[PDB]
Amino acid sequence: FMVSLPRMVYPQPKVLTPCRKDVLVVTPWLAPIVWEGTFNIDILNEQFRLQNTTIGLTVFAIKKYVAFLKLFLETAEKHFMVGHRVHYYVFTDQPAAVPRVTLGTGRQLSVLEVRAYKRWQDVSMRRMEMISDFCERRFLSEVDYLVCVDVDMEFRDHVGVEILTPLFGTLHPGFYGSSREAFTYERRPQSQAYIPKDEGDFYYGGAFFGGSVQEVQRLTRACHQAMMVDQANGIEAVWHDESHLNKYLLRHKPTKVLSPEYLWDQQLLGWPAVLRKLRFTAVP
């Protein structure tokens, strides 16, 4: 049950004025595509605070990637869900190496020890298993939404409750302007992640996805179970977990899509006019 919003003064939405004239702001299945200019964060903050929303943020820092945690967490404190309850979940093989980052009120961090796989591909892939196992262990009881990201990144601008929805994916920065045939989906029919050349809405990035705990457990379990089928058949998808994520989100459409503002690499791609904000970016 949702309590009433208070009186708020803000600009009237104008029906005959598009909010963006340069980009698609809604998918063909009526999911919003989140760009700057599409939302009034004051309204959304009120809606989510009245629900006392808690957001979980999972990040894996295994082997040398522990070096990325300090900047990741410091910048999350400046930009990620500020004003809301946040629970960071740091999965690592080196609990002792997690930096002591000072957190704002209503924010907490748990360190979860996991095994390290030898190949980076298996480290990246086995996040799905680990996230889906922790959905029972903790997440169902502790958070309303989960956001699952890569650690070799930093926040540079606001990432807030505009992203929250039952299931979201993010447009990969390398492909948002590409035609589907150019998308690096898995193309071998032998793999569970196979997508034909004439199918595909978007190429979603494996480095940023999330949703409600229930929808994330469904996604991660499905991707893990597909990976295990492939492994039994002696095949590894071309882009690992990202390939399985794309298969899942083709067949189970997200309820919001994040623009590449939310997953960017300035070294490789610069700062195009279409991006008004670079929010979460690669560490070069």
Decide: is 32 part of the binding site for a copy of itself (CB under 8 A): yes
Give the shortest CB-136-to-a copy of itself separation in angstroms.
17
Give the shortest CB-100-to-ligand U5P separation in angstroms.
19
Confirm if 7 and 42 have CB atoms less than 8 A apart: no
Q: Closest Cα partner for 274 from 11, 8, 23? A: 23
Give the shortest CB-217-to-ligand U5P separation in angstroms.
19
CA 226 to chain CA centroid, nearest Å: 20
Q: Which of these is catalytic: 77, 154, 242, 261?
A: 242
Residue 252: φ, ψ to 5°: -130, 90
Fill in the DSSP letter of residue 275. -
Q: Does 172 belong to an annotated binding site?
A: yes
83: Cβ contacts below 8 Å, ≥ 6 apart: 45, 49
Q: Does 198 belong to an annotated binding site?
A: no
Question: Distance (Å, rounded) from C-alpha 19 to C-alpha 152?
Answer: 32
Decide: is 47 part of the binding site for a copy of itself (CB under 8 A): yes
Which of a copy of itself, ligand U5P, Mn ion, none lies near 23, with the C-beta cut-off 5 to 8 A by kind? a copy of itself
Question: Distance (Å, rounded) from C-alpha 43 to C-alpha 48?
Answer: 9
Q: Considering beta carbons, is residue 149 or 222 the nearer one to ligand U5P?
A: 149
Which of Mn ion, a copy of itself, ligand U5P, none lies near 12, with the C-beta cut-off 5 to 8 A by kind? a copy of itself
Q: Which of 199, 229, 233, 268 binds a copy of itself (CB under 8 A)?
A: 199
Give the shortest CB-81-to-a copy of itself separation in angstroms.
16
- At position 207, the amino acid (one-letter code) is A
Q: Is 242 a catalytic residue?
A: yes
Q: Does 65 belong to an annotated binding site?
A: yes
Residue 155: φ, ψ to 5°: -85, 135
DSSP labels, 173-225: TTTTTS-GGGS--B--TTSTTB--TT--S--B-TTEEEEEHHHHHHHHHHHHH
Q: Which residues in this chain contact ligand U5P in the complex, by CB under 6 A?
A: 60-63, 65, 120, 123-124, 150-152
- Write out 38-73 in H/E/C secondary structure: CCCHHHHHHHHHHCCCEEEEEEEECHHHHHHHHHHH
Q: Which of 78, 119, 137, 252 binds a copy of itself (CB under 8 A)?
A: 252
Decide: is 77 part of the binding site for a copy of itself (CB under 8 A): no
Give the shortest CB-154-to-ligand U5P separation in angstroms.
12
Confirm if 78 and 107 have CB atoms less than 8 A apart: no
Q: Does 150 belong to an annotated binding site?
A: yes
Please give the positions annotated as active site. 242
Task: Name the site residues for a copy of itself (rule: CB under 8 A).
Answer: 1-2, 4-5, 7-10, 12-34, 38-40, 43-44, 47, 162, 171, 176-177, 179-180, 196, 198-202, 218, 250-253, 256, 274
Task: Name the site residues for Mn ion (rule: CB under 5 A).
Answer: 152
